[PDB]
């Protein structure tokens, strides 16, 4: 079970590996003080060097010279969960997650359709880091709904006014739970003191818009027969009007 726990709360395990999205040479030659670097820039067409410090208490994953690509394994060990999202793209991360989870499940006689796992994965992917200051601020975390609506606000209103550039970020399940919008649901979940005293400052408004709020106040939740009502009664207007 705790293996699954690690999978879901998006934990980067102990000393997994390193990556480099700046393709170039594959070598060493910096100071041998547990700060081994590389020549990962071209160094021939573009005279540069783009490397990072790292210890020398293990083996290596490259020879004295190679055409090192952008994001290949540079040290053995487990696979980080936060790198693949920004290096191998999205779909690679998804395939990794599914082939892990369905394995750890089926290996004990269980049966679980994938479409249950993926519709959980989806909620860990609601936040990106912003690059182009269109109208929001800088690289602080922001919803994909927020971006995806304000981008479209600018997209045709003014001209497009250079809307947005962002990149998906991976956050755990609890971390993506408390980080929601509705302060009521978050306040019910846990860590109530903090969320209440934080939303108190920002004069936070909370449109109900959810399932764990219409229950706190006794309303037809916006699912099930609730939407059936909001549909059928709405279809009465078009007649009596």
């Amino acid at each position: 079970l705790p293996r699954v726990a690690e999978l879901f709360e998006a934990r980067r395990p102990k000393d997994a590996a390193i990556l480099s999205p700046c393709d170039g040479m594959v070598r060493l030659g910096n100071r041998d003080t547990k700060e081994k670097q590389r020549i990962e820039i071209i160094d021939k067409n573009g005279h540069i060097v783009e490397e990072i410090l790292l210890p020398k208490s293990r083996h290596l994953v490259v020879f004295d010279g190679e055409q090192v690509s952008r994001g290949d394994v540079l040290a053995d060990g487990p696979t980080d969960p936060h790198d693949l999202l920004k290096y191998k793209g999205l779909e690679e991360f998804a395939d990794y997650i599914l082939i892990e989870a369905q394995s750890v499940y089926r290996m004990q006689g269980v049966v679980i359709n994938d479409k249950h796992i993926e519709t959980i994965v989806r909620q860990m992917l609601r936040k990106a880091v912003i690059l182009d200051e269109g109208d929001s601020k800088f690289v602080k975390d922001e919803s994909i709904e927020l971006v995806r609506i304000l981008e479209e606000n600018d997209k045709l209103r003014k001209q497009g006014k250079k809307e947005v550039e962002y990149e998906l970020v991976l956050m755990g399940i609890t971390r993506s739970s408390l980080s929601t919008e509705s302060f009521l649901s978050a306040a019910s979940f846990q860590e109530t003191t903090r969320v209440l005293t934080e939303a108190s400052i920002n004069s936070q408004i909370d449109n109900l818009r959810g399932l764990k709020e219409n229950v706190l106040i006794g309303r037809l939740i916006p699912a099930g027969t609730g939407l059936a009502v909001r549909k059928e009664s709405a279809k009465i207007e078009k007649m009596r009007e």
Binding site: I112, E118, T119, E145, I173, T193, Q204, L211, G224
Partner: protein, 917 residues
């Protein structure tokens, strides 16, 4: 709009807090001692919070309907319904301001982030430990400059006036007050425009947001330091008297009764012009009591009462599992409910349940009242109540007609998945225990060793129709987790079927001829044929093809007397080829699945009805039972043990003369015992599943009719391992860690064990037993987290229109496929088309797969396609009805309104109670 539709939170100015107050509290009094009436202007003052009785002042003068909105004059009491003692606050006047603890010790401290100082530096000022320049003055000092007492004295010496450095909450409040924003926002945004946020300006990022927020809302930032704090209506902190002539205060009454008289003494001191030391001590004691009232334990050693418990402060009521949110807002002990012990009742149908007439009389009582009154057998309410108290005879009839079609709910305590709650239709029974159809005891995960179920009633017209349409047991055949059915026969419904569906070589009536089922029935009841005989039956019936055809099938088939007895129940539409085999569990499930997918839903429940009704019948005419000679120890056991122990002596030899090391000796001993135990275990399989007999002509081996072999070759109840430990030998017992013990247990349960051999086993016994109890809280934890993450995923729209998904392929593991593509991608729609390696297209984009079309994938040799995952839908804060595919619980495309997030959440952690390692 007549209905509020947003909710907002905000800071309370001292002018709002007064606007809420229906008065003011002045002396720490609650209730008079001799007579229990409220006191003048204390914490129960009826003049402020409200009256006590209804339409009646305290002094009892103004007591008549003539005067209702009237305000008495002897006591200041109003005259109105007492129901206002719970929605009418007060307030308390604070002599010196006092810091709201929350905005100081919430990590990060908003006060700290604002004043841009480290907390402990603030607390020093607050705890009367320094001073701090409030007036800058020509003197070269700094505003937020902490000054010790003697350095302050020297500043006074050299500069006198022109600067003030006060200590205490007034200091912080004055600072926050004289803190212009537009003087600061851009000044800091320019230091951030000097962006080098490697370590320094990784800090200055938040202050931007805070100062912008405080500008955006319209809140005076000095409001975070209270000057008047409010009180809570008394009926939320009552003082009700209870038995023993005693009373039950609430912990809040005490903290209030403390802050009050501390404020009072402070005012008296400030009056009398005392020395500043005791002024300081009072002004600090007051802050302490205020913080305790808000939430004690945030900073100190939280106060306790006589019983020495840490008191239940204000904030401690709206957090924690026992708090206010997840305790009484999602809790709510409800009415119209009951609970008792469950028993089996194998006569019902899949939509019924027993109900003791007592609990029925109780749960439906008002319905009974209404029907009696309308029936003209009682005219008042006291009438009906007095006639039901004595259980008149007409009561039972009218009760029975009340509940003709009024479904109820049933629930079992640990409710892991939506099948943990289903709706049945009651029918009166005597006795005092609930009966439920056995075929569902797998969903509720119940067994009859004492489990107790609850029962709730629906009341409305929408509800008790929603229970009928969405919640009745005859709707829940397949599991939401996976399309596999959930009502398959389980324990000895399987034994009887497997038993009467076997064969025997030389039996009576063998090779006979029969025209139809009734013939075989008439014959078998006469007692000449053996039920396991082989006969020939001529059948003729329709059969449904895959493509919706229905072709006729006829002829003569070589069957068994037993299987023909099941010919009656098979509905017209399914081929006999299903029943014409040995019928172990994996095939009964096959029958039910096949029935559902082609014939309907009702056909399946009726079929399962008849299957149970028959399996129960023939599982007792066979008198299956279990002796002890049914457990047969294999014959070669002693010598197979002798070889092993001799090899062990040899290994001990190789060690004793130091010819071999230790660890290798240990490991090889382990392997020795393991392999020999494996052999002696595999032996009893042939020693119990085979029986030879000198049948006419010779002795030939046949599959045995042993009891304990049949109990496990039919998947009814058991497994090979238990058989091993019964007839074979226990083997290796792992000491707590898991490192095996270098002595294995050679005996077995039919033979019993010696004391030491039992002791060696109790270790693992206790460990494994304790490991469940220390899990039962963990899986619930994980499913709770998951329900939170995705509680608001709802299928809202038909199509999201996009054209992007994922690439699926059979998940090989270097040794096997272990999941075919044609199973991994069943029932999931296709992102784009698929081109044959010969060139022609095969399946178009947007084409929901189906066990017809899923032949056309392993047919033409395909091993990769693009499907529409919810990871790649395009709708905002929801899900389209195509990026999700088949409902996998009703075999159709997902209807719009199925809260998919919750289903997926509780179909992950639910089986987690079993996956251990």
């Amino acid at each position: 709009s007549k209905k509020f539709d947003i909710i907002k939170i905000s800071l309370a100015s001292p002018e709002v807090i007064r606007s809420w107050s229906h008065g003011e509290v002045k002396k720490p009094e609650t209730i008079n001692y001799r007579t229990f009436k409220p006191e003048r202007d204390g914490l129960f003052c009826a003049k402020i919070f409200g009256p006590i009785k209804d339409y009646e002042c305290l002094c009892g003068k103004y007591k008549r309907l003539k005067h209702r909105g009237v305000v008495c004059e002897r006591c200041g009491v109003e005259v109105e319904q007492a129901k206002v003692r719970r929605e009418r606050m007060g307030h308390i006047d604070l002599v010196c301001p006092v810091v709201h603890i929350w905005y100081l010790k919430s990590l990060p401290s908003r006060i700290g982030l604002f004043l841009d100082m480290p907390l402990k530096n603030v607390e020093k000022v607050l705890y009367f430990e320094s001073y701090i320049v409030t007036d800058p003055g020509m003197t070269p000092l700094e505003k937020k400059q902490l000054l010790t007492d003697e350095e302050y004295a020297e500043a006074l010496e050299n500069y006198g006036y022109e600067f003030e450095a006060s200590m205490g909450a007034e200091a912080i409040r004055d600072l926050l007050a004289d803190t212009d924003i537009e003087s600061e926002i851009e000044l800091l945004q320019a230091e951030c425009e000097e962006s080098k946020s490697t370590a320094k300006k990784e800090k200055a990022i938040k202050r931007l947001r805070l100062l912008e927020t405080f500008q955006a809302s319209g809140n005076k930032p000095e409001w975070m330091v209270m000057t008047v704090l409010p009180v809570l209506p008394p009926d939320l902190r009552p003082l009700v008297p209870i038995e023993g002539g005693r009373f039950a205060t609430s912990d809040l009454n005490d903290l209030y009764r403390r802050v009050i008289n501390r404020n009072n003494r402070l005012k008296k001191l400030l009056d009398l012009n005392a020395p500043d030391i005791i002024v300081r001590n009072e002004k600090r004691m007051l802050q302490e009591a205020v913080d305790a009232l808000l939430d004690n334990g945030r900073r100190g050693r939280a106060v306790t009462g006589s019983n020495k418990r840490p008191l239940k402060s204000l904030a401690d009521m709206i957090k924690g599992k026992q708090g206010r949110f997840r305790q009484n807002l999602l809790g709510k002990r409800v009415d119209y409910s009951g609970r008792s012990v469950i028993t089996v009742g194998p006569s019902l149908r899949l939509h019924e349940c027993g109900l003791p007439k007592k609990m029925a009389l109780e749960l439906f009582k008002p319905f009974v009242y209404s029907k009696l009154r309308l029936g003209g057998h009682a005219t008042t309410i006291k009438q009906a109540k007095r006639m039901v108290e004595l259980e008149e005879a007409v009561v039972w009839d009218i009760l029975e007609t009340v509940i003709n079609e009024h479904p109820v709910l049933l629930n079992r305590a640990p409710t892991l998945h939506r099948l943990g709650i289903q709706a049945f239709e009651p029918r009166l029974i005597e006795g005092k225990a609930i009966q439920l159809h056995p075929l569902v005891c797998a969903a509720f995960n119940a067994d009859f060793d004492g489990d107790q179920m609850a029962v709730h009633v629906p009341l409305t017209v929408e509800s008790q129709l929603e229970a009928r349409v969405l919640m009745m047991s005859t709707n829940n055949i397949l599991s939401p987790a996976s399309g596999q059915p959930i009502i398959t026969p389980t324990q000895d419904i399987v034994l009887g079927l497997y038993y009467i569906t076997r064969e025997k070589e030389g039996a009576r009536g063998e090779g006979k001829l029969f025209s139809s089922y009734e013939d075989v029935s008439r014959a078998y009841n006469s007692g000449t044929i053996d039920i396991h005989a082989k006969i020939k039956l001529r059948i003729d019936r329709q059969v449904f093809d895959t493509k919706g055809n229905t072709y006729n099938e006829k002829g003569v088939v070589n069957t068994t007397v037993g299987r023909a007895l099941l010919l009656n129940i098979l509905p017209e539409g399914l081929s006999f080829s299903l029943l014409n085999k040995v019928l172990v569990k994996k095939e009964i499930s096959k029958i039910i699945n096949q029935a559902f997918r082609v014939l309907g839903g009702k056909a399946t429940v009726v079929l399962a009805d008849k299957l149970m009704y028959a399996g129960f019948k023939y599982s007792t005419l066979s008198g299956v039972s279990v002796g002890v000679d049914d457990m047969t120890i294999p014959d070669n056991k002693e010598a197979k043990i002798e070889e092993a122990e001799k090899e062990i002596k040899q290994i001990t030899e190789q060690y004793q003369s130091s010819l071999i090391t230790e660890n290798e000796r240990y490991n090889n001993i382990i392997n020795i015992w393991s392999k020999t135990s494996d052999e002696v275990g595999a032996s009893m399989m042939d020693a119990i599943s085979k029986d030879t007999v000198s049948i006419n002509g010779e002795k030939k081996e046949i599959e045995s009719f042993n009891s304990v072999y049949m109990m496990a070759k039919s998947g009814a109840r058991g497994s090979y391992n238990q058989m091993r430990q019964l007839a074979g030998m226990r083997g290796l017992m792992a000491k707590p860690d898991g490192t095996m013990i270098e002595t294995a247990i050679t005996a077995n349960f039919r033979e019993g064990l010696s004391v030491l051999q039992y002791f060696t086993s109790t270790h693992g016994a206790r460990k494994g037993l304790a490991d469940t109890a220390l899990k039962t809280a963990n899986a619930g934890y994980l499913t709770r987290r998951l329900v939170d993450v995705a509680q608001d995923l709802v299928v809202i729209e038909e199509d999201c229109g996009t054209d992007d998904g994922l690439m699926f392929s059979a998940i090989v593991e270097d040794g096997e496929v272990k999941v075919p593509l044609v199973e991994r991608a069943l029932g999931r729609t296709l992102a784009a088309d698929v081109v044959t390696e010969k060139g022609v297209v095969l399946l178009e984009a947007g084409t929901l797969l189906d066990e017809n079309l899923v032949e056309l994938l392993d047919d033409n040799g395909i091993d990769m396609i693009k499907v529409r995952s919810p990871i790649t839908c395009k709708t905002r804060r929801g899900l389209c009805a195509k990026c999700y595919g088949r409902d996998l619980a009703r075999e159709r495309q997902v209807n719009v309104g199925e809260s998919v997030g919750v289903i997926a959440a509780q179909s992950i952690g639910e089986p987690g109670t079993q996956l251990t390692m």
